[PDB]
Design an enzyme around this catalytic site. Structure first.
Site, PDB file in Angstrom:
ATOM      1  N   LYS B  41       0.831  -1.199   0.000  1.00  0.00           N
ATOM      2  CA  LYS B  41       0.000   0.000   0.000  1.00  0.00           C
ATOM      3  C   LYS B  41       0.868   1.253   0.000  1.00  0.00           C
ATOM      4  CE  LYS B  41      -0.524   0.397   5.038  1.00  0.00           C
ATOM      5  NZ  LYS B  41      -1.489   0.265   6.163  1.00  0.00           N
ATOM      6  N   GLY B  54      19.185   1.497  15.035  1.00  0.00           N
ATOM      7  CA  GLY B  54      20.124   0.637  15.738  1.00  0.00           C
ATOM      8  C   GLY B  54      21.053  -0.180  14.859  1.00  0.00           C
ATOM      9  N   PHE B 122      24.897  -3.543  22.430  1.00  0.00           N
ATOM     10  CA  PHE B 122      23.461  -3.317  22.440  1.00  0.00           C
ATOM     11  C   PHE B 122      22.777  -4.034  23.598  1.00  0.00           C
ATOM     12  CE2 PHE B 122      21.124  -0.475  20.333  1.00  0.00           C
ATOM     13  CZ  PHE B 122      20.183  -0.862  19.391  1.00  0.00           C
ATOM     14  N   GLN B 243       5.925  -4.415  23.123  1.00  0.00           N
ATOM     15  CA  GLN B 243       7.171  -3.853  23.621  1.00  0.00           C
ATOM     16  C   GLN B 243       7.167  -2.337  23.747  1.00  0.00           C
ATOM     17  OE1 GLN B 243      10.717  -4.812  21.378  1.00  0.00           O
ATOM     18  NE2 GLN B 243      11.906  -3.245  22.457  1.00  0.00           N
ATOM     19  N   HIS B 245       9.335   0.876  24.191  1.00  0.00           N
ATOM     20  CA  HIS B 245      10.700   1.355  24.059  1.00  0.00           C
ATOM     21  C   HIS B 245      10.967   2.489  25.040  1.00  0.00           C
ATOM     22  CE1 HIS B 245      14.348   2.856  21.882  1.00  0.00           C
ATOM     23  NE2 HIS B 245      14.516   1.550  21.803  1.00  0.00           N
ATOM     24  N   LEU B 255      11.293   7.996  17.679  1.00  0.00           N
ATOM     25  CA  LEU B 255      12.315   7.221  18.363  1.00  0.00           C
ATOM     26  C   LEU B 255      13.748   7.734  18.274  1.00  0.00           C
ATOM     27  CD1 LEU B 255      13.476   4.982  19.884  1.00  0.00           C
ATOM     28  CD2 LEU B 255      13.340   3.490  17.909  1.00  0.00           C
ATOM     29  N   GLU B 258      18.333   2.883  20.481  1.00  0.00           N
ATOM     30  CA  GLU B 258      18.919   2.429  21.726  1.00  0.00           C
ATOM     31  C   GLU B 258      20.423   2.407  21.533  1.00  0.00           C
ATOM     32  OE1 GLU B 258      17.433  -0.980  23.769  1.00  0.00           O
ATOM     33  OE2 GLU B 258      19.259  -2.059  23.185  1.00  0.00           O
ATOM     34  N   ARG B 289      14.752  -4.302  26.946  1.00  0.00           N
ATOM     35  CA  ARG B 289      13.838  -3.193  26.697  1.00  0.00           C
ATOM     36  C   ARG B 289      12.659  -3.203  27.657  1.00  0.00           C
ATOM     37  NH1 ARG B 289      15.615  -1.073  25.843  1.00  0.00           N
ATOM     38  NH2 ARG B 289      17.621  -1.894  26.568  1.00  0.00           N
ATOM     39  N   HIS B 356       6.411   0.449  20.837  1.00  0.00           N
ATOM     40  CA  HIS B 356       7.451   0.351  19.826  1.00  0.00           C
ATOM     41  C   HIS B 356       7.376  -0.876  18.919  1.00  0.00           C
ATOM     42  CE1 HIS B 356      11.408   0.968  18.079  1.00  0.00           C
ATOM     43  NE2 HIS B 356      11.815  -0.206  18.525  1.00  0.00           N
ATOM     44  N   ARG B 400      11.485  -8.819  22.728  1.00  0.00           N
ATOM     45  CA  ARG B 400      12.450  -8.750  21.641  1.00  0.00           C
ATOM     46  C   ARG B 400      13.765  -8.103  22.059  1.00  0.00           C
ATOM     47  NH1 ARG B 400      13.186  -4.442  19.477  1.00  0.00           N
ATOM     48  NH2 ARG B 400      14.516  -3.954  17.686  1.00  0.00           N
ATOM     49  N   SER B 405      15.148  -7.603  15.256  1.00  0.00           N
ATOM     50  CA  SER B 405      14.022  -7.551  14.335  1.00  0.00           C
ATOM     51  C   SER B 405      14.483  -7.501  12.884  1.00  0.00           C
ATOM     52  CB  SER B 405      13.137  -6.340  14.629  1.00  0.00           C
ATOM     53  OG  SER B 405      11.999  -6.345  13.784  1.00  0.00           O
TER      54      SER B 405
HETATM   55  C1  LIG Z   1       8.894   1.653  14.610  1.00  0.00           C
HETATM   56  C2  LIG Z   1      10.339   1.435  14.605  1.00  0.00           C
HETATM   57  C3  LIG Z   1      10.825   0.062  14.654  1.00  0.00           C
HETATM   58  C4  LIG Z   1      12.243  -0.231  14.690  1.00  0.00           C
HETATM   59  C5  LIG Z   1      13.196   0.896  14.675  1.00  0.00           C
HETATM   60  C6  LIG Z   1      12.697   2.252  14.604  1.00  0.00           C
HETATM   61  C7  LIG Z   1      11.296   2.512  14.570  1.00  0.00           C
HETATM   62  C8  LIG Z   1      10.864   3.976  14.508  1.00  0.00           C
HETATM   63  N1  LIG Z   1      14.588   0.684  14.721  1.00  0.00           N
HETATM   64  C9  LIG Z   1      15.073  -0.638  14.788  1.00  0.00           C
HETATM   65  C10 LIG Z   1      16.454  -0.814  14.832  1.00  0.00           C
HETATM   66  O1  LIG Z   1      17.242   0.126  14.813  1.00  0.00           O
HETATM   67  N2  LIG Z   1      16.917  -2.146  14.906  1.00  0.00           N
HETATM   68  C11 LIG Z   1      16.083  -3.279  14.932  1.00  0.00           C
HETATM   69  O2  LIG Z   1      16.629  -4.403  15.001  1.00  0.00           O
HETATM   70  N3  LIG Z   1      14.709  -3.100  14.879  1.00  0.00           N
HETATM   71  C12 LIG Z   1      14.211  -1.795  14.806  1.00  0.00           C
HETATM   72  N4  LIG Z   1      12.820  -1.610  14.751  1.00  0.00           N
HETATM   73  C13 LIG Z   1      11.867  -2.735  14.741  1.00  0.00           C
HETATM   74  C14 LIG Z   1      11.845  -3.238  13.246  1.00  0.00           C
HETATM   75  O3  LIG Z   1      12.397  -2.218  12.398  1.00  0.00           O
HETATM   76  C15 LIG Z   1      10.469  -3.592  12.736  1.00  0.00           C
HETATM   77  O4  LIG Z   1       9.929  -4.589  13.548  1.00  0.00           O
HETATM   78  C16 LIG Z   1      10.547  -4.086  11.225  1.00  0.00           C
HETATM   79  O5  LIG Z   1      11.079  -3.079  10.401  1.00  0.00           O
HETATM   80  C17 LIG Z   1       9.216  -4.458  10.646  1.00  0.00           C
HETATM   81  O6  LIG Z   1       9.527  -4.872   9.285  1.00  0.00           O
HETATM   82  P1  LIG Z   1       8.446  -5.454   8.290  1.00  0.00           P
HETATM   83  O7  LIG Z   1       9.088  -5.746   7.034  1.00  0.00           O
HETATM   84  O8  LIG Z   1       7.775  -6.650   8.944  1.00  0.00           O
HETATM   85  O9  LIG Z   1       7.372  -4.350   8.204  1.00  0.00           O
HETATM   86  P2  LIG Z   1       7.266  -2.857   7.706  1.00  0.00           P
HETATM   87  O10 LIG Z   1       8.612  -2.400   7.191  1.00  0.00           O
HETATM   88  O11 LIG Z   1       6.641  -2.144   8.812  1.00  0.00           O
HETATM   89  O12 LIG Z   1       6.457  -2.915   6.367  1.00  0.00           O
HETATM   90  C18 LIG Z   1       5.080  -3.291   6.263  1.00  0.00           C
HETATM   91  C19 LIG Z   1       4.886  -3.545   4.802  1.00  0.00           C
HETATM   92  O13 LIG Z   1       3.614  -4.125   4.587  1.00  0.00           O
HETATM   93  C20 LIG Z   1       2.863  -3.345   3.647  1.00  0.00           C
HETATM   94  N5  LIG Z   1       1.502  -3.355   4.042  1.00  0.00           N
HETATM   95  C21 LIG Z   1       0.971  -3.136   5.267  1.00  0.00           C
HETATM   96  N6  LIG Z   1      -0.334  -3.206   5.326  1.00  0.00           N
HETATM   97  C22 LIG Z   1      -0.675  -3.499   4.009  1.00  0.00           C
HETATM   98  C23 LIG Z   1      -1.923  -3.712   3.344  1.00  0.00           C
HETATM   99  N7  LIG Z   1      -3.080  -3.653   3.970  1.00  0.00           N
HETATM  100  N8  LIG Z   1      -1.913  -3.991   1.992  1.00  0.00           N
HETATM  101  C24 LIG Z   1      -0.720  -4.058   1.316  1.00  0.00           C
HETATM  102  N9  LIG Z   1       0.506  -3.874   1.833  1.00  0.00           N
HETATM  103  C25 LIG Z   1       0.446  -3.591   3.223  1.00  0.00           C
HETATM  104  C26 LIG Z   1       3.492  -1.949   3.688  1.00  0.00           C
HETATM  105  O14 LIG Z   1       3.267  -1.085   2.646  1.00  0.00           O
HETATM  106  C27 LIG Z   1       4.932  -2.288   3.908  1.00  0.00           C
HETATM  107  O15 LIG Z   1       5.645  -2.442   2.720  1.00  0.00           O
HETATM  108  O1  LIG Z   2      13.878  -1.781  19.512  1.00  0.00           O
HETATM  109  C1  LIG Z   2      14.727  -1.743  20.372  1.00  0.00           C
HETATM  110  O2  LIG Z   2      14.351  -2.110  21.610  1.00  0.00           O
HETATM  111  C2  LIG Z   2      16.241  -1.272  20.198  1.00  0.00           C
HETATM  112  C3  LIG Z   2      16.673  -0.855  18.791  1.00  0.00           C
HETATM  113  N1  LIG Z   2      16.515   0.532  18.382  1.00  0.00           N
HETATM  114  O3  LIG Z   2      17.591   0.824  17.695  1.00  0.00           O
HETATM  115  O4  LIG Z   2      16.504   1.362  19.375  1.00  0.00           O
END
Ligand SMILES: *Cc1cc2c(cc1C)nc1c(=O)[nH]c(=O)nc-1n2C[C@H](O)[C@H](O)[C@H](O)COP(=O)(O)OP(=O)(O)OC[C@H]1O[C@@H](n2cnc3c(N)ncnc32)[C@H](O)[C@@H]1O
Ligand SMILES: O=C(O)CC[N+](=O)[O-]
Ligand code: HEM
Ligand SMILES: O=C(CC(=O)C(F)(F)F)c1cccs1
Ligand SMILES: O=C(CC(=O)C(F)(F)F)c1cccs1
Ligand code: SF4
Ligand code: F3S
Ligand code: FES
Lengths: 239, 613, 102, 138
Positions: B41, B54, B122, B243, B245, B255, B258, B289, B356, B400, B405
Site C-alpha cells: 500500500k 540501531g 546493544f 514492547q 521502548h 524514536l 537504543e 527493553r 514500539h 524482543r 528484528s
Molecule cells: C517503529 C520502529 C521500529 C524499529 C526501529 C525504529 C522505529 C521507529 N529501529 C530498529 C532498529 O534500529 N533495529 C532493529 O533491530 N529493529 C528496529 N525496529 C523494529 C523493526 O524495524 C520492525 O519490527 C521491522 O522493520 C518491521 O519490518 P516489516 O518488514 O515486517 O514491516 P514494515 O517495514 O513495517 O512494512 C510493512 C509492509 O507491509 C505493507 N503493508 C501493510 N499493510 C498493508 C496492506 N493492507 N496492503 C498491502 N501492503 C500492506 C506496507 O506497505 C509495507 O511495505
Molecule cells: O527496539 C529496540 O528495543 C532497540 C533498537 N533501536 O535501535 O533502538
C-alpha cells in the site's frame, strides 16, 4: 487562541469538470502540532477528510511528505508552521508533475528513472557473493557520506527547471546523485559502464548548474555538487 | 457490488508487504525462479524499516571472537522463555550468512580498521553464555541501518522480474477449505479491485503500534495483515506482549535508537541519578527493553519527571565526543533537534517509554509457514506464510532483543522463499477460485465507502488509542484491564455508526484509513483480552496482581523432587486468540512453546532460569 | 562506446576559457589576427550556446531538427559576415576602438 | 516490466487523461541563484543576437563601418545618452563574463555550496557594476 490560515491546492478526479483550485482552512495552533503535516492531519480528521496526501513516518526519513510549502519543496512533517498568523501558508503539490488527486503526484517516471541506473552493487565475479564480507577501508567508506542518506522524496528533482522542461529524458538530481553514489563505491566494478550510460545530451547534460536541488534538500544533501563530480569523471575516464 | 469491476491476476507466489521481510521474500522467490507478485500500500522504500536506526545482529566476530550460539543464548533468555528455541536456533545460526548477504548486496555498512563490518554493543548481549561480558555484534550503517537495509534490498529487487503492485491495499486472504489461494486488493490509484491468486502467499505486513495513542511507529503500522488472518478465522499469537521502548520523545513519540545507550549515552532522572544502575547493576542502562522501560515508567510514578509536568525522563549523550555522535548517531542528532530542539553534543534528549514493537502476530513455523491449532496440535495452513513483525515464529517470545528484528526480517523472509522453493516448482497448478471469492471484502469496502453514520473515523480511532494507552500500558491489573476490554469491545460496536465523507474512486485515504481502523480494532481486542487473561509477569507483560513468572516448575530452586504443574495450570505457553468478526467476541486458547532446538549436539536447549539483568 | 556528449561538453569549456583570454588579449594587442580568432571563438561559442537553449526548449523531432538547421545558418552567415568585416573593413577591434572614442 | 516499459506506461497514462500539471514557476520561491541563472541565458542570448546582427549587417547593408559611425555622429548624440547606450552594451557583456567565470569554477567542482553560492553571486554582481561603469568611461 491562535488561528493560522492554510491555503491548499485541490482537485478531485472523480468530480466531473472539476478544476484545480485553492481551498482555505483555519486551525487553532494551540490545538495542533508544530509541523505542517500535523496541520494536514488535523484538518484531515476534523475539518475535511477528503483532503488526500501521502504520509507515514512523520519523522522525516521515509520521504512520503514531499510537497511545496510556501514556494519551496520540503517534508511537511519537518517544516514547522509559520506562527505568524498574518501570513497564510500555501501548500501545493510537487512542481511540474501530474496530479493524481490533491497533493498526490505521480512519481512513476521518477522511480522508473531510478531503476535505469541500476542502483545496486555489481561485481565482475558474482560466483563468490554471500560467503565473505567485502572489505572497504573507512576512507573508501567516507566517500559515501552525504550520498547514501538520500530518502528519494523527489523534492530536488521536482525543483529543477531542467527536470521541469525535460523530465522525460533528463534523469534529474536525485537519480544522478545515486548514480554517483554507486560510481564511487570501491566495491562496485562497473564505474566505466555507469558513466557510459550517461553519454547522450539529456540524461546528465540538461543540468546547467542552477542549484535549486541542493538549495531545497530536506536532508541537507548536495545533488548539484554530485552532478559536477560526475561531469568531471565523464570528461576524464578512459575507454 | 459489481459496481467495482474485478481484475484477476495469476502468479506462483504473492507477497503482501514490501518492507525488509516482504522485500527479501519477494526477490528471494524470483531469484528462485517463481513468477512472484508483491502487493504494497506504500512505495517499498516508504516502508517502516526505513526508520530503523540501531542495527542488525550477527555473530560475525569482527570486534572480538564470537559464537552465534552466544547470540542464541542471549535471545532465548531475553524472551523470558516464551520464545520457541528452534526458531531462535535457526535465526542466530543464519544471521552471519544473512548479514554478509546484505553487505554483498551493497549495503553501506560502517567499517572497522580491518575493513570489515563495524558492530557495536546493544541491549543485553553477552559473551560465553552470559559469562564472558558485554558483546559487540550489532552490525550497522552509521545510525540509519534500517533506511540503508530497505534501500539496498529494494535496489536488489529491481534486478528481477517481480511484479510489484505499488500502492495496493490488501483487503483479505483468498481462502478456500482451509487453503490460501492468494489475496484480494484495492488499487488505490483507480479504486478498482484485484484478485491476485497464487499457489503460495506470504504475509509481511508489519506491526500494529497505531492501536495506541503514543508510538514510535509510522501512521501506516495498522496491522492489516494480522486482521486478514483474523478474518479468515485463523489464530494470532501473543498479541498482548507489546514492547515499550524506553527512549521516545515526549512529543510526537519519534524514536531515538537504543544505539545511543550502547554507544555510551545514559539515562537520568530528575534527581540526577543513573537509576538504570539501581534497578539493574550489571547491565544497567543497557538491559532488556522490557525492564529498562519498566524502570523509567516507574520513576515517573515516584514523582521524578524531568519536565513541566514531570511526565518523562532525560536521555544523555553529552559526555560523548562530539565526533562520535556524528559518526555513530548522526540520525538522532537531526530529529532530536527537529522534534525537540536539542544539541546532543551539549544537551540530553527528552525521552519517554512509548509503544514500539509487537512480538505477537501470525503463528509461524521456523520455516515461515502459518500455523492453526487443531486438537491441541500444530497444523500447517496450506500455501500461507508469514514473516517479520507481523509474524510470530516467536523468536522474540515475551520480549524482543534490540537489533533482532531487522535480522528477523531478512532471515525468515529468506526462509519463506526457501520453504516454497523447496516444497514446489514454478509453474505448478495454481488452485481454482470461486467466481465470488472476496465478495465479502468488496461489500465491506462498498459499505464504508458510503458510510453515512454519526461517528467520524478519526474520532473512533482516537477513542481506541487512548483507551489502549490507559488500560494496557507498561503496567496493568485485572480491574484496569477488564474495564479496558469492555471499553474496547464497546468501541468495536461503534464501527457501524462511523461516518465517512470522501466518496470518490481515486485515492480515498478516507476509505482506507477507515479500513485500517477495522484492522486496528481486531488487533486491540486480542491484545487487551489476551492481556487480562495472562495472570503472570513475563517479559513486557507485567501484572501488578501477579508479579510472578508462572512456569511448569519453579526454576528458582532445584528440579526433580518437585512436581510439574498441568499445562492449563501454568502460563509458560503462547496465547492463541480468535474473534467473531461480526460480534467482536474474543475466544482464546494456548499451545506449548518449543524448547528443543534443531540439533541438541550443535546448540543445546537452555532451560528456564531466573529473569534478571 | 563513443564519448560524444562528454567531449562536446569539454569543448564548450575550452572555447569558453579561450574566448575569456581573447577579450583581454584583444585589448593589449589589437591586430588582424586577434580580429579573426575573436570572430571564430565568438561565433562558435555562441553557436553551441544557443544550441543548448534549443535542445532545452524546442520539443519534438520536427522542430528541433529544423531549429538546429536554422541555427547553423545564422552561425554561418555570422562568421562569414565577421570575416568579411575583418577583410573588407576596419575589423572588430578597431571598430570597437573607433566606436568608443565617439 | 523494465525501466523503459515503465516510462512508456507513464506517458501513455498521463497524456491521455484529465490529470492537471501542478504549478511550478508560478509558485516556486525565487532565489538569487535561480535569478542569476536566468540572466546568464538572457544575456547570452541577447549577446549572441548582437554579434549576429553585426555580422549580417556587414554582409547585407551598404557602406563601411565609418559610413555608419559618421552617420550616428550627426544624430545630435547627447552625451548623457552616448554613455547610456555604451553602458547598456557593456552591462550584459560583463555580467555574462563574470558569471561565466563563476560557471567555469563550478565545473572544476568548487564553490558548490549554498553558503559559497550566495557569496559568489554577490561578488559577480558587484564586479558587474564596477566593470560596466568602468568601461562605459574608457
Ligand atoms: C517503529 C520502529 C521500529 C524499529 C526501529 C525504529 C522505529 C521507529 N529501529 C530498529 C532498529 O534500529 N533495529 C532493529 O533491530 N529493529 C528496529 N525496529 C523494529 C523493526 O524495524 C520492525 O519490527 C521491522 O522493520 C518491521 O519490518 P516489516 O518488514 O515486517 O514491516 P514494515 O517495514 O513495517 O512494512 C510493512 C509492509 O507491509 C505493507 N503493508 C501493510 N499493510 C498493508 C496492506 N493492507 N496492503 C498491502 N501492503 C500492506 C506496507 O506497505 C509495507 O511495505
Ligand atoms: O527496539 C529496540 O528495543 C532497540 C533498537 N533501536 O535501535 O533502538
Ligand atoms: C567573457 C567571455 C565569456 C565567458 C567566460 C563565457 C562563459 C560561458 C559559460 C561558462 C557558459 C555555460 C553556462 C552553462 O553551464 O549553462 C556560457 C554560455 C553561453 N554564452 Fe558565454 N561566455 C563568454 C562570452 C560570451 C559572448 C560574448 C556571448 C555572445 C555572443 C556569449 C553567449 C553565450 C550563450 C548564448 C550561452 C548559452 C547559455 C545557455 O546555456 O542558455 N558568451 N558562456
Ligand atoms: O582601444 C580599444 C580596444 C580594446 O580595448 C579592445 F581591443 F577592443 F579589446 C577601445 C577603445 C574604446 C573601447 S575599447
Ligand atoms: O529554462 C530554465 C529555467 C528558468 O528560467 C527558471 F529557473 F525556471 F526560472 C534555465 C535553463 C538554464 C538556465 S535557466
Ligand atoms: S537529494 Fe535530497 S531532495 Fe533530492 S530526494 Fe534525495 S533527499 Fe530528497
Ligand atoms: S537544479 Fe538542476 S540544473 Fe543541475 S544543479 Fe540541481 S540539477
Ligand atoms: S512522512 Fe515520512 S517523511 Fe514526512
Amino acid at each position: 487562541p491562535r488561528i493560522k490560515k492554510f491555503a491548499i491546492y485541490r482537485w478531485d478526479p472523480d468530480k466531473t469538470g472539476d478544476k484545480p483550485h485553492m481551498q482555505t482552512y483555519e486551525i487553532d495552533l494551540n490545538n495542533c502540532g508544530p509541523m505542517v503535516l500535523d496541520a494536514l492531519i488535523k484538518i484531515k480528521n476534523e475539518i475535511d477528510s477528503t483532503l488526500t496526501f501521502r504520509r507515514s513516518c512523520r519523522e522525516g526519513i521515509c520521504g512520503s511528505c514531499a510537497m511545496n510549502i510556501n514556494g519551496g519543496n520540503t517534508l511537511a512533517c519537518t517544516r514547522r508552521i509559520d506562527t505568524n498568523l498574518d501570513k497564510v501558508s500555501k501548500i501545493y503539490p510537487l512542481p511540474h508533475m501530474y496530479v493524481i488527486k490533491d497533493l498526490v503526484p505521480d512519481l512513476s517516471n521518477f522511480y522508473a528513472q531510478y531503476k535505469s541506473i541500476e542502483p545496486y552493487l555489481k561485481k565482475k565475479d558474482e560466483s563468490q557473493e554471500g560467503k565473505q564480507q567485502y572489505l572497504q577501508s573507512i576512507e573508501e567508506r567516507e566517500k559515501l557520506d552525504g550520498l547514501y542518506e538520500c530518502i528519494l522524496c523527489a523534492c530536488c528533482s521536482t525543483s529543477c527547471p531542467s527536470y521541469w522542461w525535460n523530465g522525460d529524458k533528463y534523469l534529474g538530481p536525485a537519480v544522478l546523485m545515486q548514480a554517483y553514489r554507486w560510481m564511487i563505491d570501491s566495491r562496485d566494478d562497473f564505474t566505466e559502464e555507469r558513466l557510459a550510460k550517461l553519454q547522450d545530451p539529456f540524461s546528465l547534460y540538461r543540468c546547467h548548474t542552477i542549484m535549486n536541488c541542493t538549495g531545497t534538500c530536506p536532508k541537507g544533501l548536495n545533488p548539484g555538487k554530485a552532478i559536477a563530480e560526475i561531469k568531471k569523471m565523464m570528461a576524464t575516464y578512459k575507454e | 457490488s459489481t459496481q467495482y469491476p474485478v481484475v484477476d491476476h495469476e502468479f506462483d507466489a504473492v507477497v503482501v508487504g514490501a518492507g525488509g521481510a516482504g522485500l527479501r521474500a519477494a526477490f528471494g522467490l524470483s531469484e528462485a525462479g517463481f513468477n512472484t507478485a508483491c502487493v504494497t500500500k506504500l512505495f517499498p522504500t516508504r516502508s517502516h524499516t526505513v526508520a530503523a536506526q540501531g542495527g542488525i545482529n550477527a555473530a560475525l566476530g569482527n570486534m572480538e571472537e564470537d559464537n552465534w550460539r552466544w547470540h542464541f543464548y542471549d535471545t532465548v533468555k531475553g524472551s523470558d522463555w516464551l520464545g520457541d528455541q528452534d526458531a531462535i536456533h535457526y535465526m542466530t545460526e543464519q544471521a552471519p550468512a544473512s548479514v554478509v548477504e546484505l553487505e554483498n548486496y551493497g549495503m553501506p555498512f560502517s567499517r572497522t580498521e580491518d575493513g570489515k563490518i563495524y558492530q557495536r554493543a546493544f541491549g543485553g548481549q553477552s559473551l560465553k553464555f552470559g559469562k564472558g561480558g558485554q558483546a559487540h555484534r550489532c552490525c550497522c550503517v552509521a545510525d540509519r541501518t534500517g533506511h540503508s537495509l530497505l534501500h539496498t534490498l529494494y535496489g536488489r529487487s529491481l534486478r528481477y522480474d517481480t511484479s510489484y503492485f505499488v500502492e495496493y491495499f490488501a483487503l483479505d486472504l483468498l481462502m478456500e477449505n482451509g487453503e490460501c489461494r492468494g489475496v484480494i486488493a484495492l488499487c488505490i490509484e483507480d479504486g478498482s479491485i484485484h484478485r491476485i491468486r497464487a499457489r503460495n502467499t506470504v504475509v509481511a505486513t508489519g506491526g500494529y503500534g497505531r492501536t495506541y495513542f503514543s508510538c514510535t511507529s509510522a501512521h501506516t503500522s495498522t496491522g492489516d495483515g494480522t486482521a486478514m488472518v483474523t478474518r479468515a478465522g485463523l489464530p494470532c499469537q501473543d498479541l498482548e506482549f507489546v514492547q515499550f521502548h524506553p527512549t521516545g520523545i515526549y512529543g510526537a513519540g519519534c524514536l531515538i535508537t537504543e544505539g545511543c545507550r550502547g554507544e555510551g549515552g545514559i539515562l537520568i532522572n530528575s534527581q540526577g541519578e543513573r537509576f538504570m544502575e539501581r534497578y539493574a547493576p550489571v547491565a544497567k542502562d543497557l538491559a532488556s527493553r522490557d525492564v529498562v522501560s519498566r524502570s523509567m515508567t516507574l520513576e515517573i510514578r515516584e514523582g521524578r519527571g524531568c519536565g513541566p509536568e514531570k511526565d518523562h525522563v532525560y536521555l544523555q549523550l553529552h559526555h560523548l565526543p562530539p565526533e562520535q555522535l556524528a559518526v555513530r548517531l548522526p540520525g538522532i542528532s537531526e530529529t532530536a533537534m527537529i522534534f525537540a530542539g536539542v544539541d546532543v553534543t551539549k544537551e540530553p534528549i527528552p525521552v519517554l517509554p512509548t509503544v514500539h514493537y509487537n512480538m505477537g502476530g501470525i503463528p509461524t513455523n521456523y520455516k515461515g509457514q502459518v500455523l492453526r491449532h487443531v486438537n491441541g496440535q500444530d497444523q500447517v495452513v496450506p500455501g500461507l506464510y508469514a514473516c517479520g513483525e507481523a509474524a510470530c515464529a516467536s523468536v522474540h517470545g515475551a520480549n524482543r532483543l534490540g537489533a533482532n528484528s531487522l535480522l528477523d526480517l531478512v532471515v525468515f523472509g529468506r526462509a519463506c522463499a526457501l520453504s516454497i522453493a523447496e516444497s514446489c516448482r514454478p509453474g505448478d497448478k495454481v488452485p481454482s477460485i470461486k467466481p465470488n471469492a472476496g465478495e465479502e471484502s468488496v461489500m465491506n469496502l462498498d459499505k464504508l465507502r458510503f458510510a453515512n453514520g454519526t461517528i467520524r473515523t478519526s474520532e473512533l480511532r482516537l477513542s481506541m488509542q487512548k483507551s489502549m494507552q490507559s488500560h494496557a500500558a507498561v503496567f496493568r491489573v485485572g480491574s484496569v484491564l477488564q474495564e479496558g476490554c469492555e471499553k474496547i469491545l464497546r468501541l468495536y460496536g461503534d464501527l457501524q455508526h462511523l461516518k465517512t465523507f470522501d466518496r470518490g474512486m481515486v485515492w480515498n485515504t478516507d476509505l482506507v484509513e477507515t479500513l485500517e481502523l477495522q484492522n486496528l480494532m481486531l488487533c486491540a481486542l486480542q491484545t487487551i483480552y489476551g492481556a487480562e487473561a495472562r495472570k503472570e509477569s513475563r517479559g513486557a507483560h507485567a501484572r501488578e496482581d501477579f508479579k510472578e513468572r508462572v512456569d511448569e516448575y519453579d526454576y528458582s530452586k532445584p528440579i526433580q523432587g518437585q512436581q510439574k504443574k498441568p499445562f492449563q495450570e501454568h502460563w509458560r505457553k503462547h496465547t492463541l486468540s480468535y474473534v467473531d468478526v461480526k460480534t467482536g467476541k474474543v475466544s482464546l486458547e494456548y499451545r506449548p512453546v518449543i524448547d528443543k532446538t534443531l540439533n541438541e549436539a550443535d546448540c543445546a536447549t537452555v532451560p528456564p532460569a531466573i529473569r534478571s539483568y | 562506446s563513443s564519448k560524444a556528449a562528454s567531449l562536446h561538453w569539454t569543448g564548450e569549456r575550452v572555447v569558453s576559457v579561450l574566448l575569456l583570454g581573447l577579450l583581454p588579449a584583444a585589448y593589449l594587442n589589437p591586430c588582424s589576427a586577434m580580429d579573426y580568432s575573436l570572430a571564430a571563438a565568438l561565433t562558435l561559442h555562441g553557436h553551441w550556446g544557443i544550441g543548448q537553449v534549443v535542445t532545452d526548449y524546442v520539443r519534438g523531432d520536427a522542430l528541433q531538427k529544423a531549429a538546429k538547421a536554422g541555427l547553423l545558418a545564422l552561425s554561418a552567415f555570422t562568421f562569414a559576415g565577421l570575416c568579411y568585416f575583418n577583410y573588407h573593413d576596419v575589423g572588430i577591434c578597431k571598430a570597437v576602438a573607433m566606436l568608443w572614442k565617439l | 516490466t523494465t525501466a523503459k516499459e515503465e516510462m512508456e506506461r507513464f506517458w501513455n497514462k498521463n497524456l491521455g487523461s484529465n490529470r492537471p500539471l501542478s504549478p511550478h514557476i508560478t509558485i516556486y520561491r525565487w532565489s538569487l541563484p535561480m535569478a542569476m541563472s536566468i540572466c546568464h541565458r538572457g544575456t547570452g542570448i541577447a549577446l549572441s543576437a548582437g554579434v549576429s546582427l553585426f555580422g549580417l549587417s556587414a554582409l547585407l547593408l551598404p557602406g563601411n563601418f565609418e559610413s555608419h559611425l559618421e552617420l550616428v555622429k550627426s544624430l545630435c548624440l547627447g552625451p548623457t545618452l552616448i554613455y547610456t547606450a555604451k553602458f547598456g552594451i557593456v552591462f550584459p557583456l560583463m555580467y555574462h563574463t563574470w558569471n561565466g567565470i563563476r560557471h567555469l569554477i563550478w565545473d572544476l567542482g568548487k564553490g558548490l555550496t549554498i553558503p559559497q553560492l550566495t557569496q559568489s553571486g554577490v561578488v559577480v554582481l558587484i564586479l558587474t557594476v564596477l566593470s560596466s561603469v568602468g568601461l562605459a568611461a574608457m
